[PDB]
Symmetry: C2
Subunit: 332 residues, 2 copies
């Protein structure tokens, strides 16, 4: 296993995206995102995703050269047509305007439509929290989750992410799928020949199963926390698709695009200046919550795992199997 | 068995209004709380219906909560409103800022209402429903008193911390959900303890951190578990940060009513986010949500979030609100009858 630096990995991935038809702008954005995921130990969202990115680009399913169109529609509202491109480039195109609105008006919404999101969600909220703002994001994906009480899948894994600043450390950030398990983890259990704990999914006949292969072979996933996670998943469909103008998780398919791996939906982001007109400092309040959490026994705070891995990567470099490095080099 | 009686929705509102006025609230506060409490009862939200009257009254009598507080509405940004509830209830504070909040939401596209120094002793869905009835999307969060053990922790810290959501649909009543981030709502634990029955397992623990189904064991030194596991705990933390951290109100563990015998209302805060889903849009949100409803029925989800309450609501308006004879007589006495 060879070791590559964070910036080295970025340049390598950027080359790959350029070679496969993305614009230089899109390549920069995706390379950094993917490399950041690897740096933080989010393997399921790191270099592991490259093949899926490229297979999706190959058919034109997702446009690696799309130019986001920003629409300033309100003192606290921004819409962006991702134009069948990735979501990250669209978010980047409107980020400055979004932050200006959030700081001026107190809160602002960014509604991205017609976008493909193939990464972790925490990278999208983290930057806002690093700048002292609170951010909430939702992205609906592709049909595979059975709504509570239903007999067939409808919702996507539909993740929700949240980021908030704290005076004494890195941002408090969490990113969770509303399904009981992430789709990527099901494939892993399948490859590793591992069974899943009860309640993660059902087979093609709608019967409970622990066999990841059964879930993948025409089966489906269940919502986390039963009716509660299901309600939250419905909210994600309504906010990331219904409000943005993008497709619901069931309003598109890959039947005409061999190799397509990305959902073609949308994304909602709500950015808030927690201290707008406040006689206190949110960051001090959150730091106190952290202190109290440690006090009752919670050793790890949401995000702690990634920050520790991040520190390791910046100090000793990112460790990657020579096999993967060579192929990435060949793709480059 | 306890013989029952029926009271119409308007009759119950009048009765509770009298109770609040007789016990020291301003007429504005009485109007707001009477309608809120009666609405919960009408919808079958038993944990937050008339069951809360005794607690409302003992909290008022102890001086813990100010029933005549006048909310101070603070216009702090084009899309941001804060309200100092002045140690009063949350609902009257929300009512005082409602018009301004809606104006900002429609004008700017989205707006936030940050209530601090408030007491919330009710269901959360009543707070988002009105916005959805008017074509807006609303999200709200409120924290309570400490009762939930964070994931991986040994002692309780978070409150029951519910999250509520309301959205309009072109062909029906608003889609609304109101879920506690605790495995079971704290209020339902109290109901179970009152009715002397056990709870389903896997929702709480006793003072020793051991599994229990006895509501009294949870209420007396015990604790509740976050729903769904680690994910529910993360959402509960978010509620503390949004309802208290951002508003200026106390976190669930930052208030003590030991000096106020009878105090039962959490003194914290509340966050509300109201959105015009169609701001600058080239489509209609209500049509999209109605399509989602159609698809949900198509895959087999017979009941949509909110349907349970709408069914009870219809039953209450048609046959009246069922109430234990003893409870009705108690309310009538409290009103002066």
């Amino acid at each position: 296993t060879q070791t590559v630096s964070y910036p080295q990995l970025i340049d390598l991935l950027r080359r790959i995206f350029v070679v496969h038809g993305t614009s230089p702008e899109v390549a920069d954005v995706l390379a950094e995102n993917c490399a950041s995921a690897q740096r933080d130990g989010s393997h399921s969202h790191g270099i592991f995703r490259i093949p899926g990115y490229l297979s999706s680009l190959a058919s034109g399913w997702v446009d690696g050269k799309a130019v986001p169109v920003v629409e300033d529609v309100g003192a606290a509202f921004v819409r962006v047509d991702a134009c069948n491109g990735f979501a990250q480039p669209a978010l980047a195109a409107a980020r400055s305007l979004l932050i200006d609105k959030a700081r001026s008006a107190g809160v602002a919404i960014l509604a991205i439509r017609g976008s493909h999101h193939f990464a972790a969600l925490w990278p999208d909220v983290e930057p806002f929290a690093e700048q002292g703002l609170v951010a909430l994001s939702m992205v609906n994906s592709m049909t595979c989750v059975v709504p509570h009480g239903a007999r067939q899948p409808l919702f996507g894994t539909n993740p929700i992410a949240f980021g908030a600043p704290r005076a004494g450390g890195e941002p408090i950030v969490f990113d969770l799928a509303t399904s009981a398990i992430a789709h990527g983890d099901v494939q892993i259990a399948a490859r590793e020949g591992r069974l899943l704990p009860a309640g993660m999914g059902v087979d093609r006949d709608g019967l409970p199963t622990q066999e990841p292969r059964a879930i993948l072979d025409g089966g489906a996933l269940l919502p986390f926390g039963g009716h509660k996670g299901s309600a939250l998943s419905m909210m994600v469909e309504l906010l990331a698709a219904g409000l943005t103008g993008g497709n619901f998780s069931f309003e598109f398919d890959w039947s005409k695009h061999p190799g397509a791996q990305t959902p073609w939906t949308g994304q909602l982001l709500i950015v808030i200046d927690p201290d707008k007109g406040a006689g206190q400092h949110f960051a001090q309040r959150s730091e106190e919550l952290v202190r109290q959490l440690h006090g009752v026994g919670q050793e790890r705070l949401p995000g702690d795992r990634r920050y520790l891995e991040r520190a390791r990567s910046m100090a000793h470099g990112i460790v990657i199997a020579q096999a993967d490095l060579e192929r990435l080099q060949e793709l480059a």
